Amino acid sequence: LYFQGPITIQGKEHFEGYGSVDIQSNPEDLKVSEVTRFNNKSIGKNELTGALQLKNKVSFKNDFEFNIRVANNHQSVTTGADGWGFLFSKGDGNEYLQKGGILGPKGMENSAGFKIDTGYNFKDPMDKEEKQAGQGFKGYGTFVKTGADGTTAKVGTNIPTRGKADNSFQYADNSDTTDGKFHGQLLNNLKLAYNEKSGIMRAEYAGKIWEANISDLGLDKSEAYNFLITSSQRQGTSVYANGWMRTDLNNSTFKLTPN
């Protein structure tokens, strides 16, 4: 008798791309062989948007751990990309293209995930709560859920080393040696970990930690969800490499039980 156990997969062949997603070979600044690039290819729309949909549905009956290497654009919070949305949903890549994800005020309904927010959108009440308005590289991370009507809301919390919870961090810098600590314009690991026993999804990035319960995210233990890596950018605000959000899927790892 045969039962599907955990798998660990790596590489872009396990994802289908949607919208503004393309390949960049041997990017000189990132020092790896290939990245998947968001917000470069045109899609005939002012709002560039793109998604990588994992071809396997993710079973929440079992643990998973995603280690996703991402690099952020070296660009102002008012010029660059909206950010990264790591998204779980019954919807698919085509629905995301039409309704959005978790990086703005509204998105695909009944979905949830973790966002690295790198852009200031005056229409998003979350960007105002986080004092995102600025001209540098200050962004924030948080788990996010959309309701039945599509509205995004914060879920869970930062787990600070000391003091008060804080979502903010610098998503890029003008460091002056980029070897050692966190420099968000380089490839850095985002760990997305889920423990089916505790019901907790944990995100680790930029030396910070966030947690949310799947009950508060609106995900059910017994369901299986599509997993999407997304980014978007509003054009016309900037310019070479403008808005580029890149991930190295060849050295990213995804451990899960497919379903």
User: Where are the alpha helices (H) located in the chain, listed in sequence order?
Assistant: 93-99, 125-129, 214-217
Q: Which is nearer to Na ion, 187 or 256 (CB)?
A: 187
Q: Which two tokens stand for residue 62?
A: 């079992």
Exposed/middle/buried for residue 213 (C-beta within 10 Å: 0-12, 13-18, 19+): middle
Residue 151 binding: pick among Ca ion, Na ion, Zn ion, none (C-beta 5-8 Å cut-off by kind): Zn ion
Note whether 113 and 231 are within 8 A (CB).
Answer: no
Q: Which two tokens stand for residue 52?
A: 């990588």
Segment lying near Na ion (by CB under 5 A), choices 12-20, 57-65, 180-188, 212-220 = 180-188
Q: Which is nearer to Ca ion, 34 or 95 (CB)?
A: 95
The minimum distance between CB 153 and Na ion, in angstroms, equals 33
Please pick, from the candidates 9, 10, 11, 30, the single residue that binds Na ion as defined by CB under 5 A: 30
Q: Which is nearer to Na ion, 172 or 186 (CB)?
A: 186
Segment lying near Na ion (by CB under 5 A), choices 8-16, 30-38, 215-223, 245-253 = 30-38
Please pick, from the candidates 80, 91, 93, 107, the single residue that binds Ca ion as defined by CB under 5 A: 91
Binding status of residue 35 toward Na ion by CB under 5 A: no
Measuring CA to CA, how many Å separate 82 from each of 44, 144, 152, 208?
18, 14, 14, 20
Q: What is the CA radius of gyration of the chain?
A: 17
Binding status of residue 249 toward Na ion by CB under 5 A: no
The minimum distance between CB 153 and Zn ion, in angstroms, equals 8
Binding status of residue 174 toward Zn ion by CB under 5 A: no
**Going residue by residue from 116 to 155, which x/- string records binding to Zn ion, judged by CB under 5 A?**
-------------------------------x-x-x----
Please pick, from the candidates 74, 145, 208, 234, the single residue that binds Zn ion as defined by CB under 5 A: 74
The minimum distance between CB 69 and Na ion, in angstroms, equals 8
In whole angstroms, give the CA distance from residue 59 to residue 43. Answer: 32
Q: Which two tokens stand for residue 197?
A: 């026993």
Please pick, from the candidates 70, 144, 186, 224, the single residue that binds Na ion as defined by CB under 5 A: 186
Question: What single string gives the DSSP state of each residue in 36-92?
Answer: EEES-S--SSSEEEEEEEESSPEETTS-EEEEEEEE--SS-TTTS--EEEEEEESS-
In whole angstroms, give the CA distance from residue 205 to residue 190. Answer: 5
In whole angstroms, give the CA distance from residue 101 to residue 7. Answer: 27
Q: Which residues of this chain interact with Zn ion, rule CB under 5 A?
A: 11, 74, 147, 149, 151
Q: Which residues of this chain interact with Ca ion, rule CB under 5 A?
A: 91, 117, 119, 121, 127
